[PDB]
C-alpha cells in the first residue's frame, strides 16, 4: 500500500519570464509567456492579444529565448530547463494543426558542479553564432550553434571571475563579445572578453574594466546606433561604451531596487523599468549627432511614468501597450501616455490577467448551498495582496441580463415559420404574460396575436401544425403562424381554472385539481381525445416523447400531491402502466422523462429540493433503480437543453446543478451561479446557441461552458496576507496581514499607501504590557530611514468580504500562525506571535494571544508569553498544540480562561509544521525532516513515534493517514513516509520508512484536505480516495489522491504506453523530469502517477488511442478479464478528470 | 579564496522568520535560505557544548564511520584492531570485536552500504575485510602477499558497486563488490593515506598519499597504467582529502597546518587555503578535516603549535569548524576537563550530533 495520484487543479498563474519576437510567423509580432512548465505564445493584435498555442513542457523554463539564424524566415526559440534540458524549438502550422517541433535538444549540464546562488543565465549571441550559459561558478558554458549541432554538445570556459552577476553579449563587435558584472573582495566591477568557438577560450573585450556602483544588477546590451551596455543599480544607471562612460543618479531610484528593463525601440532610444515597489520608468538615450563623426550619446535621462503592478519582467508590445509579468500579484496588459493625465499617469491598464501566487496559506470551506462542497481561500502579496476565493463549476457567460424580477417561466419562440432560429422571449409573472421580441441583440415588449397577457403562461411554444399554443391559467390556446390568429382554444368545460400543464409539438395534458384532459394539435383543432380524474391533485406534468417516437408520446409522467406518487401513465387511455411512491409529507415540483445516451430516464424534483431518478423502460412503463439526490433547499424545476448533439437537464434551484451521462450513469456538474429559478434554450439571431436563465430579480441571456471548469473572486488589501482561516461560528474569515511602514525621524512606523488595515473604521491595538525594550532605540534596517514590518490581525466577513475589524499586534510582533477554536466556552481567534528584533537571527520572546470577535468588537481575552516563536498551532482534542521553537508545547484551557502548560516534546531543531490527526502529531522540523509523536491519554504526555531518517528541507507537511506521511521539499519534491511495527523488541517500527518520491516542480506552501467537486455515495468510482488540496508559489494548485493498489498499477503502466506515443516538447524524457532531483540526489520516483500524463491521454488521435490500449488486459469491475478498448479507457480517464 | 564573495543571507540583518518568510515568497534565493539555516545551525552548535556521551575501549582511536542511517548508530576502529558498533541513546553494550592488538590498526572503517549489518575494514594485518559485526568475515577484499605491505585506506561506493582500497606503499586496488580486481597500478610512491571516490560521479577517484600529492582519476575511462586526470601539489604529505557531499569540492587536510578546498570547477589549483594547526606526532593519529553532510561547514581538530602563526591569541585544543566558502573560523568546540587532540571528527547523516575520536576517547557532541 501507499499509492499517490497528483493531478493539477489550476496551474500556475505566475510569470516566470516573457519574451518577444516572430516566433509564429514573421508578419507577426508574437508574445511568449513561460509560467513555469507552461509556455503560452501569442499575437499582437491592435486591440490585445490572440492566443494561438499554449504547451505544457517536461521540465521548469529557466532560460527562453528568441533568436534569428541566418536562412531561417522566422525566429526559433530556444529553451533551457532547470534540470538542465535544452532544445530549440520551431513553429509549425500544418494547415490547421499547431505543432512544436525539437530541432535541436540534449542535457547540457556537467557531471559535477553546484549551481550559482544567482542561479542560471542564459544569453544568445546578437548574430546567433552560439549560444552562452552561466550555469556553475567560474565557468563559462558555450553551445556552438553555429553549424549542424543537434545533440547541443557543448564545451565549458573557465572564467577567473568566479561571482557573476549579470552577463549579456555586446552588440557590433568583430567577435562574440561578452560583457559582465562580477564580484571580488574590491566590489563589483565591469569586465568584458571574447568568445572564439575557434580555439575554446575567452580572449579579451574592447576594454580592459571599470570600477561600477555598488549594487549593480542589470548589464543592458544596447544595439547598433549606439552599441554599449547600460549598467542599472540602485541610485545609479551608468552607460559604458568602451572609452565613453557617462552616469547619473536620479533621486527617484532610492525607493526601491530595479528588478527588470525591457528595450522599446529597436535602435535602442528608450528603455522600460520596471520597479520593485511597483513602479515604471521610462530611460531615454539623449541622441547627439555632432556634424560628421556622427550619432553620439549626450546624456541619459529617467521619468517615472507611473504604477504598474510589482513586474517580474515586462515587454513593450507596440502603439504603447506594454505586458506587465508579475509573479506577485495580477500579470497585466497596460497603454502608455503621450500627456499625462490626472495624478501624472502615462499608465492605465488595459487587461488584468489574474494570478494566484505565491499563495502563502489557503483553507477550504463550504459556502455556495453547504452542500459538498466546495470554494478555496487563498493569499497573496505586497501592495498586490490579496484573498482569492476559488470555486468548481459550469460557467455562464453573460451577453445579455435585464433588471426584470418575478419570473414565473420563460419560453423561446419561432414567430416566423420560415426562421430556423427563436426570435422570441416569452416570460411570465404572476399578473401575466409578456412577450420579448428578439430583434439584433436587441429585445422588445411586443405582443404577438392570438397570445393573451392577462393572467400568466404555464407553458407556449411552436407546434404541430405550423402553429403556436399558448396555455394559460385560464384556457389553452391555439395560434396560427401564418396571419398570426387565435384558431382554436380550449377551456374546461364548466369555466374552470387550469392548475398544471404539458405540451410536447403535437400533443397537450392540462389539468384541473384532479381533472386531466388530453388533448391534440392538428390544423385549425384543438381536439379533446381523453379525460381522466387522479387519485388526489396533479402536482406536475410530462410528455416528452422518447426517442423512436414520433413528437407523439406512448407514455404520459404526473406527479401526484397528497399521496406524493410518481406515476407513467399510458397516454392514450391513461392507463396507469406504474404508481412509484416518493416520500413523506414534501409535494413533488417537476417531473421529467429523458433520454441519456439512448437510455431512458424518469427524473422527478421535490419542493425540499431532493430529486429522484429511474431507468424507464419505454415499453412497460417500468421504473427501475431509484436513487436519490438533494442539491439545495429550492424546489428544483426541471428543464431540458442540449449540449452538442447530446442532451443534458438543468436543474434550477437555490444551488443550480446540470445533469448529464457519460458512459450510462449521470454526472452532476455543479452550475457556477447564485440562485436560478428558471430556464431554456434561447437559440436568437443575436443570441446562438445560448441560454435564457431568470432568478428573481434578472432576466440573463447567455452562453454556458462546454464542460465544469474551475473560477476565482479577487479580495484586494494592498498588504501582505500571510495566514487565513474560517470561523464558521461568527460567520467570518480571520486574517494576519502586514504592512510595510518606513522608520520615521522620530518614532518609526507610518505607512506609505493605505491598505486593508488603515481603511478600517472598527479597529484596535493591544498594548499589553509584557516586554521591556531597550533604554536606547536599537534601530537597525536604518536608525532613521528604511522600512518596518507591522503586522495585525484582520476580519473579513463571509459573503461581500468587507473588512470587519483590524488589529495590531504587539508592534514587533511578526505573528506566523491563525487559529478558530473551542476548549469549552465561546470560539476564539488565536494567534502565535513572532517578535522579530531587525536585527537578532534568532527569535527568543513568544506570544500566544487569545482572541473573541463580536459586533466588530474584537477582545484581547488571554495570553501566555513564550520564550521563542510559535511557528504554528493546532486545535488538539480540545486542546492547543503549539510548536514554539525547538520545543513542541501542548498548552490547555482552564476555567479563568488562561492558556496553562501542560506536557512538552523537546527534540527539535526548527519545528516549522505541525499536523495532528486524531491522537497522532506530525511535526516537520525544518532543519532535520520529519517526526511522528503521539499523545498518549491515561498517561498525559508526549511519546515519540517514529523519525524519518534522510533530513529534507521540507517546505510543507500533511498527514494522509495515520500510516502515510506527505512531504515536499525545497528541492520542489514530494516523499512519502510510512508507519509499521517489527518483530523482536527491536523496533523500525521507529523508523520512518519514506515510500513515495515525485519531483513536482513546483513549491509548496500549505497542504489541506477538503476538495472543489461534489461527491457521490455508492455510484461514481474509487480510484480517488483520499483529497488533499495544495498551494503553489507559482500559484499551481494541485490535488494528490490515495490509489488502490490495483489502479495504480495499471497508470503505472499506462503511463509508460503513453510515454512510447505523445511528442514530448524537447524530447525531455517524462520518467527522467519526474525522476526525483535534489543537488546531490537524483532518484527514478516511485508510489505517484502524474494526472497531467493519465488526462493528456483525452488529447490524442483514436489510432494512437488504440495503440496505447493494445494488448492491454483490463479488469472493469467484472473480475472477468477482457481484452481493453479505446473506450473503456476514455470513461476512465474522463471520470479521473471529475475529481478536481 | 572565497566560493564567490560570500553568500550573504537575505532581508535586513537576516532574522530567520524574515528569511524563511521570503522563501515562502517566492522572493528568496535557496542558497540564500541555505546559508540563514546555515547560521541557524551554527547558532545551535554553540550549545553542542556538551558531550552527551563519552566512552572508550582500548589502545587509541584510528577510524570513525557513521551508521549511514541511523542518527545513533557509529562505527569505531582501533589501532588494536577493534571495532565498536556503538548505538548511543540505547544503553546497551556496544557490539564489539576484539582485534590482534599487536599490528592490525584499523586504518580505515566504512559501513557496507549494501547491507549495514556489515562493514568494509584496511588493516594494518594487510587485508581489506568484508566482515559482520558479530566478528566474521565473509570475503578477505584484498590481502599483502608480503609482511610489512598492508592497507591504510578506504572508500566504497554502493551506486558504482566498487572497493578502492590503498596500500602503505602506493598501490591502490580496485575491486568489484564481488571481490574481482580491476586495478592494481601503484599510483602513488609512498603510503596511500586516502581514498575517497565522488559521492555524484561514480567513477571519479580522490586519492591522497604521504608522497604529499592528491590524485584524481577516471576508473572507467583511465585503468592505462598510472596515468590519472590531475595531481595537486602540497606544501607537506597528505594526511586525507575526502569530497564534499555534491561531489564538487575537494578538501585536503595536509600534515602541518595546511587544509584546502578544491573546486570542481578546478579540481587542478585550490580554491582557497586554510591554514591550521594539526601536525605529526607519534601516538597520535592523524588528523583529519571533514565536511557537515548538510551546510556548508568543516570540522576539525586543532592541535596548537607554538610554531605556527596564531592568528587568535588563545590557542587551546579546540574543535574547529570553518565557513567553507570563506574559509575562516566560524566556532571552537571546547570541553575543559574533556579535551584533549581531537583527530577525527564526524557529522551525522543528519549533521545534528558530532561524533570525535579524541585519541583514545569517543565524543557524541549533541545539544542540550
Known amino acids: 500500500m501507499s499509492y499517490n495520484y497528483v493531478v493539477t487543479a489550476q496551474k500556475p498563474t505566475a510569470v516566470n519570464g516573457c519574451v518577444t519576437g516572430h516566433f509564429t510567423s514573421a508578419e507577426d509580432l508574437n508574445l511568449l509567456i513561460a509560467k513555469n512548465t507552461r ?597 428544483t424545476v426541471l428543464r431540458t437543453f442540449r449540449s452538442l448533439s447530446t442532451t443534458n437537464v438543468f436543474a434550477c434551484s437555490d444551488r443550480p446543478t446540470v445533469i448529464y451521462s457519460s458512459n450510462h450513469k449521470l454526472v452532476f456538474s455543479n452550475v457556477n451561479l447564485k440562485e436560478v429559478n428558471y430556464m431554456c434554450p434561447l437559440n436568437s439571431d443575436g443570441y446562438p446557441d445560448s441560454l435564457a436563465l431568470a432568478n428573481n430579480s434578472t432576466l440573463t441571456i447567455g452562453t454556458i461552458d462546454e464542460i465544469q471548469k474551475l473560477h476565482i473572486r479577487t479580495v484586494p488589501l494592498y498588504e501582505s496576507p500571510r495566514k487565513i482561516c474560517y470561523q464558521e461560528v461568527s460567520q467570518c474569515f480571520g486574517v494576519l496581514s502586514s504592512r510595510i511602514e518606513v522608520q520615521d525621524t522620530s518614532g518609526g512606523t507610518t505607512a506609505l499607501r493605505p491598505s486593508a488595515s488603515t481603511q478600517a473604521l472598527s479597529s484596535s491595538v493591544s498594548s499589553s504590557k509584557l516586554f521591556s525594550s531597550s533604554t536606547a532605540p536599537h534601530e537597525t534596517s536604518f536608525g532613521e530611514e528604511v522600512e518596518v514590518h507591522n503586522l495585525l490581525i484582520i476580519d473579513q466577513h463571509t459573503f461581500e468580504v468587507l473588512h470587519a475589524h483590524q488589529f495590531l499586534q504587539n508592534e514587533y510582533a511578526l505573528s506566523l500562525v491563525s487559529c478558530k477554536l473551542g476548549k469549552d466556552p465561546n470560539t476564539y481567534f488565536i494567534v502565535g506571535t513572532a517578535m522579530v528584533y531587525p536585527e537578532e537571527a534568532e527569535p527568543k520572546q513568544g506570544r500566544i494571544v487569545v482572541f473573541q470577535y463580536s459586533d466588530g468588537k474584537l477582545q484581547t481575552v488571554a495570553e501566555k508569553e513564550v520564550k521563542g516563536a510559535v511557528y504554528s498551532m493546532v486545535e488538539f482534542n480540545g486542546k492547543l498544540l503549539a510548536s514554539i521553537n525547538s520545543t513542541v508545547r501542548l498548552y490547555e484551557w482552564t476555567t479563568e480562561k488562561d492558556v496553562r502548560t501542560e506536557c512538552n516534546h523537546y527534540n527539535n531543531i526548527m519545528a516549522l509544521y505541525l499536523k495532528t490527526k486524531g491522537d497522532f502529531i506530525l511535526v516537520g522540523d525544518l532543519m532535520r525532516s520529519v517526526l511522528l509523536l503521539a499523545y498518549k491519554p491515561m498517561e498525559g504526555n508526549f511519546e515519540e513515534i517514529a523519525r524519518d531518517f534522510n533530513p529534507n528541507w521540507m517546505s510543507a507537511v500533511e498527514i494522509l493517514d495515520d500510516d502515510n506521511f506527505l512531504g515536499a521539499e525545497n528541492a520542489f519534491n514530494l516523499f512519502v513516509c510510512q508507519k509499521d511495527s517489527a518483530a523482536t523488541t527491536d523496533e523500525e517500527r521507529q523508523h520512518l520508512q519514506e515510500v513515495g518520491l515525485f519531483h513536482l516542480g513546483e513549491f509548496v506552501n500549505v497542504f489541506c484536505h477538503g476538495s472543489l467537486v461534489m461527491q457521490n455515495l455508492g455510484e461514481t468510482s474509487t480510484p480517488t480516495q483520499g483529497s488533499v488540496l495544495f498551494g503553489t508559489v507559482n500559484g499551481m494548485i494541485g490535488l494528490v489522491t490515495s490509489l488502490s493498489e490495483s489502479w495504480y498499477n495499471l497508470l503505472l503502466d499506462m503511463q509508460n504506453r503513453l510515454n512510447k506515443v505523445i511528442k514530448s516538447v524537447g524530447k525531455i524524457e517524462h520518467s527522467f523530469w519526474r525522476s526525483f532531483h535534489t543537488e546531490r540526489k537524483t532518484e527514478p520516483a516511485t508510489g505517484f502517477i502524474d494526472g497531467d500524463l493519465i488526462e493528456s491521454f483525452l488529447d490524442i488521435s483514436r489510432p494512437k488511442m488504440q495503440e496505447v490500449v493494445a494488448n492491454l488486459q483490463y479488469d472493469d469491475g467484472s473480475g472477468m478479464k477482457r481484452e481493453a478498448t479505446a473506450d473503456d479507457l476514455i470513461k476512465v480517464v474522463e471520470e479521473l478528470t471529475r475529481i478536481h | 579564496w572565497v566560493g564567490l564573495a560570500g553568500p550573504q543571507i537575505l532581508p535586513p540583518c537576516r532574522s530567520i522568520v524574515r528569511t524563511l518568510h521570503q522563501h515562502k515568497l517566492g522572493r528568496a534565493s535557496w542558497p540564500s535560505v541555505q546559508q540563514g539555516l546555515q547560521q541557524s545551525f551554527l547558532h545551535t552548535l554553540d550549545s553542542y557544548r556538551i558531550l552527551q556521551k563519552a566512552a572508550p575501549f582500548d589502545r587509541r582511536a584510528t577510524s570513525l564511520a557513521w551508521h549511514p542511517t541511523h542518527p545513533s548508530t557509529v562505527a569505531v576502529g582501533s589501532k588494536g584492531g577493534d571495532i565498536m558498533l556503538w548505538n548511543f541513546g540505547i544503553k546497551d553494550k556496544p557490539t564489539f570485536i576484539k582485534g590482534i592488538g599487536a599490528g592490525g590498526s584499523i586504518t580505515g572503517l566504512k559501513f557496507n552500504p549494501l547491507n549495514t549489518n556489515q562493514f568494509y575494514a584496511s588493516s594494518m594485518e594487510g587485508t581489506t575485510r568484508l566482515q559482520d559485526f558479530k566478528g566474521n568475515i565473509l570475503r578477505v577484499f584484498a590481502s599483502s602477499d608480503t609482511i610489512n605491505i598492508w592497507f591504510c585506506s578506504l572508500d566504497v561506493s554502493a551506486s558504482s558497486r566498487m572497493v578502492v582500497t590503498g596500500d602503505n606503499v602506493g598501490n591502490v586496488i580496485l575491486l568489484n563488490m564481488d571481490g574481482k580486481e580491476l586495478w592494481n597500478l601503484r599510483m602513488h610512491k609512498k603510503k596511500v593515506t586516502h581514498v575517497a571516490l565522488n559521492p555524484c560521479c561514480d567513477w571519479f577517484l580522490a586519492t591522497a598519499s604521504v608522497d604529499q600529492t592528491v590524485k584524481i582519476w577516471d576508473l572507467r575511462q583511465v585503468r592505462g597504467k598510472a596515468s590519472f586526470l590531475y595531481s595537486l601539489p602540497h606544501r607537506h604529505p597528505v594526511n586525507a582529502a575526502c569530497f564534499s557531499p555534491d561531489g564538487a569540492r575537494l578538501l585536503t587536510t595536509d600534515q602541518k597546518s595546511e587544509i584546502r578546498v578544491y573546486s570542481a570547477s578546478q579540481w587542478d589549483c585550490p580554491l582557497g587555503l586554510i591554514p591550521h594547526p594539526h601536525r605529526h606526532f607519534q601516538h597520535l593519529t592523524p588528523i583529519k578535516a571533514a565536511w557537515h553532510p548538510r551546510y556548508n561547514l568543516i570540522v576539525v581538530g586543532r592541535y596548537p603549535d607554538p610554531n605556527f602563526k596564531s592568528c587568535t591569541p588563545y590557542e587551546l585544543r579546540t574543535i574547529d569548524v570553518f565557513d567553507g566558502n570563506s574559509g575562516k573560523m566560524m566556532c571552537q568546540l571546547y570541553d575543559p576537563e574533556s579535551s584533549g587532540i581531537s583527530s577525527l571528527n564526524e557529522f551525522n547523516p543528519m549533521g545534528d550530533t558530532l561524533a570525535s575520536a579524541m585519541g583514545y576517547h569517543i565524543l557524541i557532541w549533541s545539544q542540550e
Open chain 1, 39 to 635: 509556455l503560452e505564445i501569442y499575437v499582437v493584435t491592435a486591440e490585445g492579444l490572440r492566443p494561438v498555442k499554449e504547451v505544457g513542457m517536461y521540465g521548469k523554463i529557466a532560460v527562453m529565448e528568441l533568436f534569428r539564424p541566418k536562412g531561417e524566415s522566422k525566429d526559433l526559440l530556444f529553451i533551457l530547463t532547470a534540470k538542465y534540458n535544452a532544445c530549440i524549438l520551431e513553429y509549425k502550422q500544418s494547415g490547421e494543426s499547431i505543432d512544436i517541433i525539437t530541432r535541436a535538444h540534449g542535457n547540457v549540464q556537467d557531471r559535477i558542479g553546484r549551481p550559482s546562488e544567482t542561479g542560471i543565465i542564459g544569453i544568445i549571441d546578437p548574430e546567433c553564432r552560439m549560444i552562452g550559459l552561466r550555469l556553475y561558478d567560474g565557468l563559462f558554458k558555450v553551445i556552438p550553434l553555429d553549424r549542424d549541432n543537434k545533440e547541443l554538445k557543448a564545451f565549458n570556459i573557465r572564467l577567473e571571475e568566479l561571482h557573476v552577476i549579470d552577463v549579456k553579449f555586446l552588440y557590433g563587435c568583430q567577435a562574440p563579445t561578452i560583457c559582465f558584472v562580477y564580484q571580488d573582495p574590491q566590489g563589483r566591477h565591469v569586465k568584458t572578453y571574447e568568445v572564439s568557438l575557434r580555439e575554446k577560450e575567452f580572449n579579451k573585450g574592447p576594454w580592459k574594466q571599470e570600477n561600477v556602483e555598488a549594487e549593480a544588477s542589470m548589464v543592458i546590451a544596447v544595439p547598433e546606433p549606439f552599441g554599449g551596455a547600460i549598467i542599472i543599480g540602485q541610485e545609479s544607471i551608468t552607460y559604458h561604451n568602451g572609452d565613453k562612460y557617462l552616469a547619473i543618479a536620479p533621486p527617484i531610484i532610492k525607493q526601491s531596487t530595479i528588478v527588470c528593463h525591457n528595450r522599446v525601440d529597436p535602435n535602442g532610444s528608450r528603455y522600460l523599468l520596471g520597479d520593485m515597489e511597483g513602479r515604471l520608468f521610462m530611460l531615454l538615450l539623449e541622441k547627439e549627432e555632432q556634424m560628421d563623426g556622427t550619432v553620439t550619446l549626450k546624456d541619459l535621462r529617467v521619468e517615472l511614468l507611473g504604477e504598474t503592478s510589482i513586474a517580474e519582467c515586462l515587454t513593450y508590445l507596440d502603439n504603447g501597450v506594454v505586458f506587465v509579468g508579475s509573479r506577485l500579484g495580477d500579470s497585466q496588459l497596460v497603454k502608455l501616455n503621450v500627456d499625462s493625465n490626472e495624478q501624472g499617469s502615462y499608465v492605465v491598464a488595459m487587461e488584468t490577467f489574474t494570478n494566484l501566487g505565491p499563495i502563502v496559506d489557503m483553507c477550504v470551506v463550504d459556502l455556495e448551498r453547504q452542500g459538498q462542497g466546495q470554494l478555496v481561500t487563498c493569499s497573496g502579496a505586497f501592495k498586490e495582496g490579496s484573498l482569492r476565493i476559488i470555486r468548481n463549476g459550469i460557467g455562464i457567460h453573460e451577453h445579455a441580463s435585464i433588471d426584470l424580477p418575478g419570473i414565473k417561466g420563460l419560453w423561446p419562440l419561432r414567430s416566423d415559420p420560415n426562421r430556423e432560429t427563436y426570435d422570441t422571449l416569452v416570460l411570465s409573472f404572476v399578473g401575466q404574460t409578456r412577450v420579448l421580441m428578439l430583434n439584433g441583440e436587441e429585445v422588445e415588449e411586443t405582443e404577438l396575436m392570438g397570445f393573451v397577457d392577462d393572467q400568466q403562461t404555464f407553458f407556449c411554444g411552436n407546434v404541430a401544425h405550423q402553429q403556436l399554443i399558448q396555455i394559460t391559467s385560464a384556457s389553452v390556446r391555439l395560434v396560427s403562424q401564418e396571419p398570426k390568429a387565435l384558431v382554436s382554444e380550449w377551456k374546461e368545460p364548466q369555466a374552470k381554472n387550469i392548475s398544471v400543464a404539458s405540451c410536447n409539438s403535437s400533443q397537450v395534458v392540462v389539468a384541473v385539481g384532479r381533472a386531466l384532459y388530453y388533448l391534440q394539435i392538428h390544423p385549425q383543432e384543438l381536439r379533446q381525445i381523453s379525460h381522466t380524474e387522479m387519485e388526489h391533485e396533479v402536482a406536475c406534468l410530462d410528455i416528452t416523447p422518447l426517442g423512436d417516437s414520433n413528437g407523439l408520446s406512448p407514455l404520459c409522467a404526473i406527479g401526484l400531491w397528497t399521496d406524493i406518487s410518481a406515476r407513467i401513465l399510458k397516454l392514450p387511455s391513461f392507463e396507469l402502466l406504474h404508481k412509484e411512491m416518493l416520500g413523506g409529507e414534501i409535494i413533488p415540483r417537476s417531473i421529467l422523462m429523458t433520454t441519456f445516451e439512448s437510455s431512458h430516464y424518469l427524473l422527478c424534483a421535490l419542493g425540499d429540493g431532493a430529486l429522484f431518478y429511474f431507468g424507464l423502460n419505454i415499453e412497460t412503463g417500468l421504473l427501475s433503480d431509484r436513487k436519490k439526490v438533494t442539491l439545495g433547499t429550492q424546489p
